[PDB]
Amino acid sequence: DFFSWRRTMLLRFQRMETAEEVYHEIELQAQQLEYDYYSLCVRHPVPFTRPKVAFYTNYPEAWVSYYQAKNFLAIDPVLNPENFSQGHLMWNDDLFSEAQPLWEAARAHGLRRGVTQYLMLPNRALGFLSFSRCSAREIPILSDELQLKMQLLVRESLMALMRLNDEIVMTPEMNFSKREKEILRWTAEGKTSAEIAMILSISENTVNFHQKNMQKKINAPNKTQVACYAAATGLI
Amino acid sequence: DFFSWRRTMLLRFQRMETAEEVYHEIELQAQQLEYDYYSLCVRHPVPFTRPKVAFYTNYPEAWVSYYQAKNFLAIDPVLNPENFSQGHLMWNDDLFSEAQPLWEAARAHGLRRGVTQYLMLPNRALGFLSFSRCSAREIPILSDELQLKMQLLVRESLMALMRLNDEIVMTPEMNFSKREKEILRWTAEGKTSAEIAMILSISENTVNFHQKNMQKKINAPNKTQVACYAAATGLI
Numbered sequence: 399d400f401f402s403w404r405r406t407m408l409l410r411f412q413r414m415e416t417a418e419e420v421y422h423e424i425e426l427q428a429q430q431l432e433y434d435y436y437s438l439c440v441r442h443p444v445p446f447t448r449p450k451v452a453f454y455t456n457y458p459e460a461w462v463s464y465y466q467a468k469n470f471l472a473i474d475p476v477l478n479p480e481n482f483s484q485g486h487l488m489w490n491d492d493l494f495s496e497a498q499p500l501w502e503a504a505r506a507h508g509l510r511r512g513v514t515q516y517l518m519l520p521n522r523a524l525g526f527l528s529f530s531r532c533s534a535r536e537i538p539i540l541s542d543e544l545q546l547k548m549q550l551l552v553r554e555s556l557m558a559l560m561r562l563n564d565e566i567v568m569t570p571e572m573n574f575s576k577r578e579k580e581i582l583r584w585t586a587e588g589k590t591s592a593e594i595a596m597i598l599s600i601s602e603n604t605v606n607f608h609q610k611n612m613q614k615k616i617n618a619p620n621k622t623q624v625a626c627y628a629a630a631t632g633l634i
Numbered sequence: 635d636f637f638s639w640r641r642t643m644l645l646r647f648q649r650m651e652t653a654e655e656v657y658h659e660i661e662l663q664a665q666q667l668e669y670d671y672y673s674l675c676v677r678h679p680v681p682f683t684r685p686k687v688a689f690y691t692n693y694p695e696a697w698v699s700y701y702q703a704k705n706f707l708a709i710d711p712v713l714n715p716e717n718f719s720q721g722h723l724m725w726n727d728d729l730f731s732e733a734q735p736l737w738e739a740a741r742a743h744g745l746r747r748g749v750t751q752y753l754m755l756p757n758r759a760l761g762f763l764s765f766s767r768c769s770a771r772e773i774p775i776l777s778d779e780l781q782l783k784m785q786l787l788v789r790e791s792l793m794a795l796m797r798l799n800d801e802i803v804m805t806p807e808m809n810f811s812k813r814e815k816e817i818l819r820w821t822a823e824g825k826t827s828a829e830i831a832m833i834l835s836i837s838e839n840t841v842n843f844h845q846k847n848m849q850k851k852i853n854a855p856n857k858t859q860v861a862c863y864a865a866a867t868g869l870i
């Protein structure tokens with residue numbers, strides 16, 4: 399019964415107090431669905447220029463280390479939201495036609511089958527939950543059931559990890575005052591210091607004071623980086 | 635059976651060819667759940683300074699017109715994601731303690747009960763689907779069922795409307811070239827024209843050429859507004 403399954407899982411992820419409890423539960427759930435491995439990968443919205451990818455997996459260390467050394471991240475189709483439908487992606491051979499080194503390496507080490515579910519988080523990070531299996535044998539599972547179950551697992555695990563302030567999911571902290579945020583908003587709209595001073599009935603010195611403090615807080619070189627980081631993560 | 639309900643609804647929203655077909659189906663679904671009214675509201679990510687709110691409802695015109703004239707949008711708690719749990723919000727009296735003019739106006743015109751479901755879209759717009767009822771009488775409905783059904787309805791209606799390029803959900807168009815986007819990314823990271831010229835092995839003239847074309851395309855006063863709009867909507 400899905401309604402009861404769902405009821406239990408929300409409560410289990412609600413009550414978790416550590417990252418390892420989240421990872422252990424995902425491992426157990428993968429196992430119940432008859433999967434050998436999981437990986438949880440998060441493409442952060444920033445830096446814009448080389449976005450951070452953070453992960454946690456039970457794949458053997460040699461495989462992860464190999465995936466990293468071959469730069470399979472650049473070709474990995476399982477981490478591209480454009481090829482998901484309804485947040486869901488059952489792996490097939492066609493998926494890997496532009497990622498043949500990855501497909502060959504994976505099949506040579508014993509991987510046969512897998513599935514990925516994804517979600518965009520409130521901070522605009524993209525979370526991907528993959529399950530994989532070394533067995534090519536048909537397991538009977540309702541497509542709808544698997545989809546809905548992984549929908550919850552990817553959301554709750556990453557919501558728990560967000561609540562637990564985990565490095566895998568957290569974007570740079572921008573503890574900005576109300577007034578700083580207000581000035582930032584006018585900045586993002588293309589207003590100059592002079593125009594913002596008129597809008598808010600303050601001096602340019604005051605505007606630039608606030609700009610400077612926000613730059614200082616996050617170690618930014620200018621207001622553009624502050625506004626863009628704020629805009630990207632939804633702080634603004 | 636939820637699995638079959640879900641199967642039919644995905645197909646119905648997939649096959650829709652107009653906005654009215656989407657709205658008509660939401661109206662019918664509200665009615666099946668025993669609701670009198672629906673409203674579909676979308677808080678756009680931009681402009682940052684007065685974010686656009688676009689809506690479609692079957693509420694009487696006099697009510698909408700009244701809600702607008704009283705500026706109930708400023709106090710409306712049903713459109714604040716901070717008070718949702720799992721994207722879901724069953725209306726209660728406590729919800730409106732800081733929105734008493736709205737609650738009094740609504741109850742005086744005959745509203746008694748309602749529910750809201752929300753979703754953040756790929757473009758960072760926030761979509762809210764509300765159902766409401768003039769009857770205070772207990773309807774028997776499984777909380778889990780109602781939650782999961784509205785989860786699909788809010789997603790599919792707004793995904794259909796995104797596919798149909800509807801004004802309710804679409805953010806400003808930024809048809810930017812690969813090279814324009816690349817320069818934009820370095821801009822959002824805090825790089826100057828000179829630094830970008832060195833990074834990409836081009837002249838400052840070339841960099842500024844591209845900046846200008848992007849400014850011209852969307853009618854922006856400077857690169858900051860272009861980068862922030864791009865960053866906010868996820869174009870970057």
Ligand SMILES: [Cl-]
Pocket residue numbers: 482483484485793
């Ligand atoms: Cl989709």
Ligand SMILES: [Cl-]
Pocket residue numbers: 510534
């Ligand atoms: Cl095979």
Ligand SMILES: [Cl-]
Pocket residue numbers: 557718719720721
């Ligand atoms: Cl939540």
Ligand SMILES: [Cl-]
Pocket residue numbers: 746770
């Ligand atoms: Cl009552």
